[PDB]
Write a protein that binds this ligand. Structure first.
Ligand code: SF4
Lengths: 786, 464, 97
């Protein structure tokens, strides 16, 4: 008995020191939310994120691998720095914490047996570890200039066995350079020794290239003044001369910075060249290995590659990537969003350029030796809390909304472009349903290709399906969609999207095109160029939207919760409040989209859960005032009436309740902040009502529950989640709590769980479970229960 | 130079004073409940700023960055920008929203990418493209001491609290939730904190005559309670979607003609005290949707012709300003003198210093000073001894040319020091103070740190 | 003057309270701490019963430009509150040319 984590979904932050690679292994480890996610692009399988190292408390800012060693350091907004050591070939673990720095950390850079920390208090700290004990000891903590300086970026270089330098930039126009020499555990003779001139704004990027020829190398600098400049550095016996004791014309800007570091080492630094030609502030500068080239990212999302000019001596940009015009999610004119990080690496000879997007979407380009380029499959995910989940009626593609108005539409990849099954199927995002100004709290799926949603406005909306998406799914996820030809043609790109389009005003500008993978269900792709992978990041933001069908009013506040009748004819909805008259429910009919007159007044506080019975006869109502009710329906006019009620089930508020199948005889379960899970059974011998069977309690508050669709070996399944993030799987028959397992803390979403949902369409002898939490995460688990 | 005004927008919401009156105030157009429904109140959503806000889905970062870049690309280079917020009642929204909003608005210019607003403002102090304050719009019911502390921490410098009338029936018949008298204590508590306060007025309202309109303004300017540092006059225009159009539909409303309104404006402009800046008698309106009223694009263009026919022309700040550099230096000015006025306003004595030409009445530089009282101060900075506050420093005296032997190549760069030492003289002698403080935007916390003022909390203070 | 109705919800004054519902996990309540709201009078207006030392003469006054005038007297209001209580109230009225 075991599980298999099917998918992991998360989005990147908007900082600059987040990304990091390990060249010998090439494991992209980047911070996200309050954890550090791992990913690997070099694989025939495009799986994605597989593990999120946890342990922090606030948002992570700086992540750095120690170059060719066995450690990794992270820094978070919690005013803390954490150490990690390889515990497995592809897994790490926290080993040490740092208890200094009441203020946060902004800059981070490290070389073996040294840690550089820039505390926004205004201080710079240098650490050196011990010979035999892995606790990185403290060597020095100093300040460049109190009161008027704040660091932004740091860097390091090893001059010799025991001699090192250090560069500092930030809220000024000069680049400071200090030096120090090694000792037993501490550092001595450490002070600022050079103040290079240059830019007219804040220093933002530093880069020390390796030493090809010993003692002489180059430093690059970029600033908010849109210009990039260079500085050449030489060791003694190669320092440029004739500055002293020679009749020559010294210019104002060609000053040479010489320093006698020690009794035997003197370094000379000069200015070399000025590089410009950009549209916004520089954000990332990265070196190379086999060329004198640099990668430049701006705030306009533009990407430039700067190369030396053997003809004119002044470096000219080699390649310019990112000509697509896109600002934010809604594009009107110009482009914006920028690139807030970068990585550059080649496997054999395909160069790879990866950058973080504006909505937590990695964008990665492969290229054939500086000539031609092509975008490969990236990653996408949520950037805020994940509230509500909803499966497909058939047991298919799920919808998982969030607080950042980015509706999701995932799907499994089973047709692997070879006409056969992928040996190991992988999940990906296949459609982005809707975007708008509000938060899109609640969403529900009624039929195979229809859904009803509601955010923080007082209205509910019902949407439709375009054509291209239908064919694209029936190609890649493949599963047959019957009578899909009745749907009319839709569009792809709206200038501003309250929803997509379902009319004759526009059309689709992509032709029917099977570019690749034509060996499974050929000519199923509705007009589009058939990819070799799920839709691209350039396509997700402006192509895969679903048009809206109907609007419907009725509430007096923002939408809280709704549910769909099993007959797919009736729907119930309700908004939150604490007054008696604003805690009612309103119902609508799908064939006419109209309100039914009578009201359902029973509660005085916010409605928490709305759930019809297994048959369209009863409706469950649960709230926070610890009162629950069951209402009966008249099949003639679909109206309702109150039948069953109870007023003292718990002491703390009730969070979630779920039903039971028709086989076992209409049982239900309630979960409340009393950490109490109570099971309610039916009995009618001495009185026709619902009775109490048993209950269980945990150490922390329960948050959501889910019960499997059917029964397995005269017992059913149960899932319970906490606000600590753990998940418990249970087997249960009448009166018997047969605990299955507690899910691993090494896989759980660290924050409060919000919604757990069991799927029904079993395939490969296993079932699926969808987990949505407020940890900026949405996960899929598999159950191959025997 | 390069003074910039970049307006931003907040997400739509509902001011809670509707709750105890039922609807919005009668004259407020549009709103979430109206047909537009994607727009903050008092704005129809058809303004250019509304368009730029909608396409960004009401996000401060994108609006600020886009407007700044557009202004820079047009041909002007910006290094001094003042933010202004609009729409409804910004303070009603929850806690985290305001914090995140302010942090984003400061990190847009600072280039910072952090949190913990203290650090954001600390980095914004040491940044290029300095910010010279914020202008927050709020209501009397939300100006309590906790909220005032919040605004002081954020970096705001001046408020604008509307009153719209001084009669007592208008407050209830316009569905506005505050008695008139409480605004006076609001002004009293606000002023002692150093916040410049500006108000609003609307001449024509239902059940108001031309007379009552005249003496309400007269009482506003004369009474020692309604003396504030600014004004805005909004002639009443009837939009179809407002609660004002219903009155005209039912015949329960009628407006003034053109002659009556121009005479009223002419009389009003002939009474303004010389320390209040009349902002806009010729305000900006949604033009085609108005159903009742008169044209307002050139009201003052005719009011000036009226004062030239009756005498006693206007004396506000705006008409007498000469500007930072060469706005009216086509002619060499005349005798320059120092004029000092004193007045009692909101339970305290205040002083207004200016450098003016008395023969032709132009203005070059001005300063405001307040002697702190004992019945309104609550800050731990001002509750330890007597103190005085420089509410505003204003130096258009950055003028290069002048009258009476201007500095040759020093060109009035020490002109502001004259006023600063003048203020310190009477702070030491007349007030008998033991500490003097100045309030300013975070971006200009160094033009005052050279004269000796040192930082405590959100204030720039030095002892005696 | 009253207008407090919104469709698709229960509104209008007399009982309705809120438009700014918010939650807290510790059972928060009350918009208290905002004094002097609702400029409508807290209770029914006061009466104008006369004091003992007052006389009972008839007074007439004019205006500056002599277009309107005013005259004072003492009415006997029936005070519908009690069908046996009637109040002698000092009040004046305004007349024209
Ligand atoms: S207080 Fe302001 S936002 Fe609210 S109704 Fe009145 S004018 Fe509109």
């Amino acid at each position: 008995e075991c599980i298999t984590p099917e998918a992991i979904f998360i989005g990147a932050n908007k900082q600059t020191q987040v990304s990091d690679i390990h060249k010998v292994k090439k494991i992209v480890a980047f911070g996200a939310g309050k954890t550090i996610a791992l990913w690997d692009p070099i694989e025939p399988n495009n799986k994605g994120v597989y593990a999120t190292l946890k342990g922090h408390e606030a948002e992570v800012t700086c992540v750095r691998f120690v170059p060719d060693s066995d450690f990794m350091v992270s820094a978070s907004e919690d005013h803390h720095v954490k150490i990690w050591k390889f515990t497995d070939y592809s897994h790490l673990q926290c080993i040490q914490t740092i208890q200094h720095y009441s203020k946060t950390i902004v800059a981070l850079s490290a070389l073996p047996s040294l840690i550089s920390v820039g505390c926004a208090d205004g201080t710079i700290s240098i650490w050196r570890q011990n010979i035999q004990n892995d606790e990185f000891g403290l060597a020095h903590e100093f300040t460049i200039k109190k009161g008027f300086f704040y660091p932004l970026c740091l860097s390091l270089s090893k001059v010799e066995e025991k001699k090192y330098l250090l560069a500092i930039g930030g809220t000024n126009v000069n680049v400071f350079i200090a030096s120090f020499i090694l000792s037993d555990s501490g550092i001595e003779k450490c002070r600022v020794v050079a103040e290079l001139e240059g830019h007219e704004d804040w220093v933002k990027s530093l880069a020390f290239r390796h030493q090809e020829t010993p003692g002489d190398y180059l430093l690059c600098s970029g600033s908010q003044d849109r210009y990039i400049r260079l500085w050449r550095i030489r060791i003694n016996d190669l320092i440029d001369d004739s500055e002293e004791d020679s009749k020559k014309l010294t210019l104002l800007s060609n000053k040479q910075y010489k320093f006698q570091i020690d009794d035997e080492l003197r370094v000379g630094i000069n200015f070399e060249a000025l590089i410009m030609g950009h549209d916004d502030w520089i954000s990332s500068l990265q070196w190379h290995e086999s060329r004198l080239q640099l990668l430049a990212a701006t705030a306009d999302t533009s990407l430039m590659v700067w190369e030396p000019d053997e003809t004119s001596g002044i470096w000219v940009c080699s390649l310019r990537l990112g000509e697509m015009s896109s600002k934010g999610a809604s594009t009107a004119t110009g482009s914006s969003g920028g690139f807030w990080s970068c990585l550059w690496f080649t496997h054999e000879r395909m160069d790879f350029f990866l950058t973080n997007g504006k909505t937590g979407s990695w964008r990665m380009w492969a290229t054939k030796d500086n000539i031609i380029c092509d975008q490969r499959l990236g990653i996408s995910g949520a950037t805020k809390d994940v509230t509500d989940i909803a499966w497909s009626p058939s047991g298919e593609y799920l919808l998982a909304t969030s607080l950042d108005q980015t509706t999701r539409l995932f799907a499994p990849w089973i047709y692997d472009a070879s006409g056969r099954k992928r040996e190991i199927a992988t999940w990906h995002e296949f459609s982005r349903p809707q975007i708008h100004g509000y938060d899109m709290i609640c969403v529900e799926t009624v039929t195979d290709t229809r859904f009803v949603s509601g955010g923080d406005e007082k209205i509910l909306r019902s949407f439709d399906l375009p054509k291209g998406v239908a064919g694209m799914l029936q190609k890649f996820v493949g599963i047959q969609f019957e009578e899909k030809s009745e749907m009319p043609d839709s569009a792809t790109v709206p200038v501003l999207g309250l929803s997509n389009k379902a009319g004759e005003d526009d059309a689709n500008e992509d032709d029917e095109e099977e570019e690749g993978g034509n060996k499974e269900t050929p000519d199923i792709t509705d007009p589009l160029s058939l990819l070799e992978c799920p839709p691209m990041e350039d396509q997700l933001q402006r192509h895969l939207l679903w048009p809206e069908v109907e609007k419907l009013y009725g509430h007096g506040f923002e939408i809280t919760c709704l549910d769909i009748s099993p007959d797919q004819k009736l729907i119930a909805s309700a908004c939150r409040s604490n007054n008696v008259q604003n805690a009612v429910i309103r119902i609508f009919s799908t064939e006419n989209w109209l309100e039914i007159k009578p009201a359902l007044p029973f509660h005085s506080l916010t409605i928490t859960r709305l759930k019809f019975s297994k048959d369209g006869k009863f409706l469950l109502s649960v709230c926070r005032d610890r009162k629950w009710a069951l209402w009966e329906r008249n099949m003639e006019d679909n109206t309702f009436e109150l039948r069953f009620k109870n007023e003292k089930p718990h002491t703390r508020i009730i969070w979630d309740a779920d039903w039971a199948p028709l086989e076992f005889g209409n049982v239900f379960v309630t979960a409340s902040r009393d950490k109490t899970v109570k099971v309610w059974r039916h009995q009618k011998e001495p009185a026709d009502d619902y009775v109490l069977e048993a209950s269980i309690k945990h150490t922390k508050a329960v948050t959501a529950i889910s019960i499997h669709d059917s029964m397995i070996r005269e017992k059913i399944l149960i899932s319970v989640g906490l606000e600590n993030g753990e998940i418990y799987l249970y087997s249960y028959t009448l009166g018997k709590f047969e605990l299955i397992t507690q899910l691993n803390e090494d896989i759980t979403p660290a924050d409060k769980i919000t919604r757990l949902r069991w799927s029904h369409l079993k395939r490969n002898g296993k079932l699926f479970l969808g987990v949505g939490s407020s940890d900026l995460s949405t996960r899929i688990y598999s159950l191959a229960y025997e | 130079s390069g003074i910039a005004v970049v307006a931003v927008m907040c997400k739509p919401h509902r001011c809670p004073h509707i709750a105890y009156t039922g609807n919005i105030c009668v004259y407020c157009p549009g709103g979430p409940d109206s047909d537009f429904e994607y727009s903050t109140q008092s704005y129809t959503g058809y303004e250019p700023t509304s368009m730029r806000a909608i396409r960004a889905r009401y996000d401060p970062y994108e609006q600020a960055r886009g407007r700044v870049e557009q202004l820079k690309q047009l041909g002007h280079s910006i290094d001094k920008v003042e933010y202004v917020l609009m729409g409804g009642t910004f303070m009603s929204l929850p806690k985290e929203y305001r914090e995140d909003f302010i942090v984003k608005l400061h990190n847009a210019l600072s280039g910072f990418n952090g949190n913990d607003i203290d650090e954001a403002i600390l980095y914004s102090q040491q940044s290029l493209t300095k910010c010279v304050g914020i202008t927050i719009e709020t209501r009397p019911d939300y100006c309590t001491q906790t909220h005032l502390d919040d605004m002081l921490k954020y970096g705001c410098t001046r408020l604008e609290i509307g009153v719209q009338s001084l009669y007592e029936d208008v407050a209830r018949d316009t569905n506005r939730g505050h008695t008139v008298r409480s605004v006076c204590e609001t002004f009293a508590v606000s002023k002692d904190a150093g916040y410049k306060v500006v108000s609003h007025m609307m001449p024509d309202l239902p059940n108001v005559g031309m007379e009552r309109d005249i003496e309400q303004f007269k009482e506003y300017f004369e009474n020692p309670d309604f003396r504030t540092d600014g004004l805005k006059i909004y002639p009443t225009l009837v939009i179809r979607g407002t609660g004002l159009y219903e009155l005209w539909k039912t015949g329960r409303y009628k407006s003034y003609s053109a002659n009556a309104l121009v005479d009223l404006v002419a009389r009003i402009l002939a009474l303004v005290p010389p320390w209040t800046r009349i902002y806009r008698v010729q305000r900006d309106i949604p033009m085609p949707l108005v159903t009742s009223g008169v044209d307002n694009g050139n009201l003052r263009e005719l009011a000036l012709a009226r004062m030239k026919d009756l005498g006693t022309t206007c004396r506000d700040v705006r008409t007498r300003e000469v500007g930072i550099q060469e706005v009216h230096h086509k002619v060499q000015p005349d005798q320059v003198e120092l004029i000092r006025r004193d007045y009692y306003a909101n339970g305290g004595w205040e002083t207004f210093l200016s450098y003016e030409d008395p023969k032709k009445d132009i203005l070059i530089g001005l300063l405001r000073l307040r002697k702190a009282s004992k019945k309104y101060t609550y800050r731990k900075e001002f509750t330890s001894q007597r103190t005085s506050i420089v509410r505003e420093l204003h130096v258009y005296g950055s003028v290069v040319p002048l009258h009476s032997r201007d500095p040759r190549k020093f060109q009035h760069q020490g002109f502001g020091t004259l006023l600063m030492e003048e203020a310190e003289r009477i702070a030491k002698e007349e007030h008998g103070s033991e500490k003097i403080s100045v309030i300013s935007g975070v971006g200009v916390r160094n033009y005052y740190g050279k004269l000796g003022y040192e930082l405590d909390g959100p204030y720039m203070s030095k002892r005696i | 003057v009253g207008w407090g109705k919104k469709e698709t919800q229960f509104r209008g004054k007399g009982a309705r309270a809120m438009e700014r519902e918010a939650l807290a996990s510790l059972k928060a309540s009350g918009l208290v701490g905002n004094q002097l709201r609702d400029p409508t009078m807290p209770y029914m207006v006061d009466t104008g019963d006369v004091t003992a030392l007052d006389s009972h003469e008839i007074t007439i006054s004019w205006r500056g430009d002599c277009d309107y005038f005013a005259v004072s007297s003492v009415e006997e209001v029936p005070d519908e509150d009690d069908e046996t209580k009637s109040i002698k109230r000092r009040a004046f009225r305004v007349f024209s040319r």
